[PDB]
Design a protein around this ligand. Structure first.
Ligand SMILES: O=C1c2ccccc2C(=O)c2c1cc(NS(=O)(=O)c1ccccc1O)c(O)c2O
Ligand SMILES: [Cl-]
Lengths: 240, 233
């Protein structure tokens, strides 16, 4: 191949379990989520994968997935770059609610609309929201401009703030021939996948990336995939 | 007043701290890992906040940092790794206990090596079990041939650590970044010797405790305002 690139969605989180919308809430991995990451790492190790640089978000579910993979592959010494721009989509006022609470309050017609829409954002997270201070006042976002700090995001917004990091920080590493590992989130990784494969808005919203499973890309000199993405793992986890 | 915190990793596996672990990439033992947890809890209890972290490229230091950041809920922090904060490269002595060192190289050289501030140990011979494990490890592939150590005296170690402190760490402190450094006895010695203006003799007698946060208050010139303080019960 011309360039090798590996992507991985964080393993299952404690809130994925509860079916609670996390978004920018910094939920940790569940024990099952940790094992997923560990197994993904062992799959990367059995295949003899080597990286030169790692990108991740500022969210511990992604960072811990990266740590567990680096540990399994004996590459804890690699440089690791964190950015809010790889964060999960900001779910606004839905943050902290489970799916029952969401349906109860908004009705399933509205949930379906949000679910199937590329560019309609959920309600904004406002100053009386239970997680407002927890997220908006977190010092990790202190350097964001007023315009950059979302009160909510559509998938399109998420992708819009994710791609500039890909373009400016990841692409140059790849073109240098550095072997890149990105440990992040379903929606931030969709931005990358959509961009690589030129997927439609409809198709990307159908793309469901599984937690803790390494995704492998082989790109041409124009960073276009030469073949479709491939999942790494034992034959079972791969099939499913 | 600037706040700087240092932490030295604890016990590594297979008694390797007593076997010139040096540049061999030994992991923490479970006890060494627990030390890091307790160190991290102290930092949590005290409410310490950091803005950036520095560590070596050796997993025992890196795992110490990871354990600390986890404990204080600051896993989102920027982390910078450098060979320049590595332990001393002990060359041919690496992996050997005290008896084996004496038996191999004799009591004469052994005595000199132990008390000397600037006499390097001998480099690994091609039959050393760590020979290719260390010298061909790709984490050092960017090093110039003359940057790539094969064996270091304490002086050599301090001399390649201080440029990193000056060029990379000092500027972060001056802009008010709260720095955490997780590293090794000998690389931390370099930093302490420079901060406190210690002599060769004094630094070789300074044995920094492991697994415990070492706190410095620094003035505008990065000069310590008081003796190093330890956090904990
Ligand atoms: O409600 C949403 C949703 C709402 C607003 C924007 C995007 C989505 C969205 O993308 C989504 C949803 C539900 C489910 N299935 S679920 O009801 O079982 C569900 C799972 C986890 C959290 C909330 C759950 O409800 C999905 O698979 C989705 O991809
Ligand atoms: Cl890291």
């Amino acid at each position: 191949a011309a360039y090798k690139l590996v992507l991985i969605r964080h393993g299952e989180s404690a809130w994925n379990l509860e079916n609670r919308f996390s978004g920018w809430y910094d939920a940790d991995l569940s024990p099952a989520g940790h094992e997923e990451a560990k197994r993904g790492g062992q799959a990367l190790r059995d295949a003899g994968y080597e990286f030169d640089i790692c990108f991740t978000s500022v969210q511990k579910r992604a960072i811990r997935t990266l740590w567990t993979v680096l540990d399994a592959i004996d590459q804890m010494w690699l440089p690791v770059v964190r950015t809010w721009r790889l964060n999960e989509r900001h779910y606004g006022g839905l943050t902290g609610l489970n799916k029952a609470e969401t349906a109860a309050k908004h009705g399933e017609a509205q949930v379906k609309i949000w679910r199937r829409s590329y560019d309609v954002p959920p309600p904004p997270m406002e100053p009386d929201h239970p997680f407002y201070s927890n997220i908006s006042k977190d010092r990790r976002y202190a350097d964001l401009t007023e315009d950059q700090l979302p009160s909510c995001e559509s998938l399109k917004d998420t992708i819009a703030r994710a791609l500039p990091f890909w373009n400016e920080e990841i692409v140059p590493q790849i073109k240098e021939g550095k072997r890149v590992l990105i440990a992040a989130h379903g929606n931030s990784l969709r931005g990358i996948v959509k961009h690589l494969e030129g997927l439609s808005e409809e198709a990307i919203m159908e793309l469901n990336l599984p937690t803790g499973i390494p995704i492998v890309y082989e790109l041409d000199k124009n960073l276009k995939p030469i073949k479709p993405m491939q999942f790494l793992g034992d034959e079972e986890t791969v099939r499913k």
